[PDB]
Amino acid sequence: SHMEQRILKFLEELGEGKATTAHDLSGKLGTPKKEINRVLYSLAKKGKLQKEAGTPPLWKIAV
Amino acid sequence: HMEQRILKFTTAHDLSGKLGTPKKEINRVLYSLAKKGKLQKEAGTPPLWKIAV
Amino acid sequence: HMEQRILKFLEELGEGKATTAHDLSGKLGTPKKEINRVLYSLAKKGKLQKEAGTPPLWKIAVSTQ
Amino acid sequence: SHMEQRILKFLEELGEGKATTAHDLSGKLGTPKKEINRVLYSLAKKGKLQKEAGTPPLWKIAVSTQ
DNA sequence: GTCGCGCGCCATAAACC
DNA sequence: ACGGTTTATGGCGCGCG
């Protein structure tokens, strides 16, 4: 929920309909993709984030 | 719709009758929900459950 | 080699009906890790189609043209 | 079942207070990770091994319980 | 009768930079 | 005498009869 917050913050910042990727997040936060992804996927089951299947997947805030 | 009802309503095996749902499906929404911080798993055999206030 | 086995096995099942990687793992006498490894490789090669689920169901790839 | 014996042996031959992952046991023992974990988890219930929390879990020969 | 399991995941090939 | 490092649905925690 700290790093969940780093990520959520960043998404909300970066546009209001925008998406992004684990690789993008990882750069803009000096964090291994593994970590970013650990949290992105957690957040998704929690209903918080919305994921668009793809190579790589695209992540945006949900309702 | 399950997540919703699961809330309004103990064991998963015991949840299969009250809502008429296969145990698999209940254990799914349980472990998920406790991962959402809302529920909380007790160590029984089988495991027991209760809404974390 | 293991691929054409799975395919061959997905022929003798009647068009429409699908199967799981556990099921295959038994029938074909092969560890599930290898089965799935190959299954996911055939779907991506086009030969097969994956119907994501719990567990996922696998059948011959169906043209959508 | 000489799998238990082989793993306990490997975890002993690794050193004092030292741990390792099941992926690693499967590698060296040349044994499917499926069986390795089935067994690892088994030895932990029997009390012989302890499972350190992690991703993945780390294992080592127990040192506390009776 | 615990069990939620979706798992292929690299003893990797290809792709990036 | 030389392409090192990251990706992939790569998140994996899995042991399940």
Side-chain angles (χ1 to χ4, degrees), chain A residues 1 3-63, chain B residues 2 10-53, chain C residues 2-65, chain D:
Chain A
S1 212
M3 179 56 88
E4 310 186 79
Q5 264 195 226
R6 294 244 296 171
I7 292 167
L8 287 177
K9 178 56 65 61
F10 190 89
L11 280 158
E12 188 170 56
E13 305 275 68
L14 183 60
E16 290 144 42
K18 269 73 189 88
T20 193
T21 69
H23 170 275
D24 189 358
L25 263 31
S26 155
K28 250 68 258 153
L29 300 174
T31 301
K33 184 157 65 71
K34 198 153 173 180
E35 255 297 304
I36 296 298
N37 274 315
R38 259 166 181 142
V39 181
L40 286 169
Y41 285 86
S42 160
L43 286 174
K45 289 285 190 71
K46 293 185 180 178
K48 281 182 167 271
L49 278 185
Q50 213 158 268
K51 180 256 273 180
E52 159 168 347
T55 298
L58 288 172
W59 302 87
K60 62 204 291 185
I61 306 297
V63 201
Chain B
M2 173 78 274
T10 161
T11 305
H13 143 83
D14 179 54
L15 266 330
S16 300
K18 309 302 178 286
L19 286 154
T21 311
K23 196 184 37 47
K24 190 155 150 73
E25 229 286 90
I26 297 290
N27 272 325
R28 190 174 292 152
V29 184
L30 292 197
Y31 280 83
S32 162
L33 199 63
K35 198 173 71 151
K36 296 187 185 178
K38 289 170 202 172
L39 230 202
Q40 184 166 44
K41 205 185 83 164
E42 215 77 75
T45 169
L48 325 167
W49 309 79
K50 54 183 193 192
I51 285 281
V53 184
Chain C
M2 181 69 234
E3 311 194 347
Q4 54 172 168
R5 283 242 282 152
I6 288 175
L7 277 318
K8 179 202 169 66
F9 191 89
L10 288 171
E11 317 296 34
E12 298 132 19
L13 301 173
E15 284 292 84
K17 299 82 188 144
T19 188
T20 68
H22 187 228
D23 189 46
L24 299 191
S25 193
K27 304 297 160 71
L28 290 164
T30 299
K32 206 157 61 64
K33 179 195 203 80
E34 183 172 335
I35 292 310
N36 266 326
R37 173 138 183 67
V38 150
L39 283 185
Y40 276 81
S41 185
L42 302 183
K44 172 175 213 179
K45 272 181 187 193
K47 307 273 184 157
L48 275 183
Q49 165 191 279
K50 181 192 61 176
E51 284 194 322
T54 293
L57 293 161
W58 297 85
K59 68 166 291 190
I60 302 293
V62 188
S63 186
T64 47
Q65 81 168 67
Chain D
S1 176
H2 305 284
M3 193 56 246
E4 305 197 335
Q5 289 68 199
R6 180 122 78 276
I7 272 167
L8 272 162
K9 165 190 179 177
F10 182 102
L11 291 188
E12 233 146 3
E13 282 190 41
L14 187 72
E16 30 49 278
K18 224 102 159 171
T20 187
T21 71
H23 178 270
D24 184 55
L25 274 318
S26 182
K28 304 298 207 330
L29 304 193
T31 308
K33 194 161 64 64
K34 183 173 195 147
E35 197 190 326
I36 293 293
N37 278 318
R38 194 193 76 242
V39 172
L40 283 184
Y41 278 76
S42 194
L43 307 179
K45 220 160 177 190
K46 298 168 134 58
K48 320 209 82 168
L49 294 180
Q50 65 189 198
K51 162 182 154 156
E52 302 195 310
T55 306
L58 291 150
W59 305 84
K60 55 183 287 174
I61 295 169
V63 277
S64 212
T65 50
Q66 65 182 68

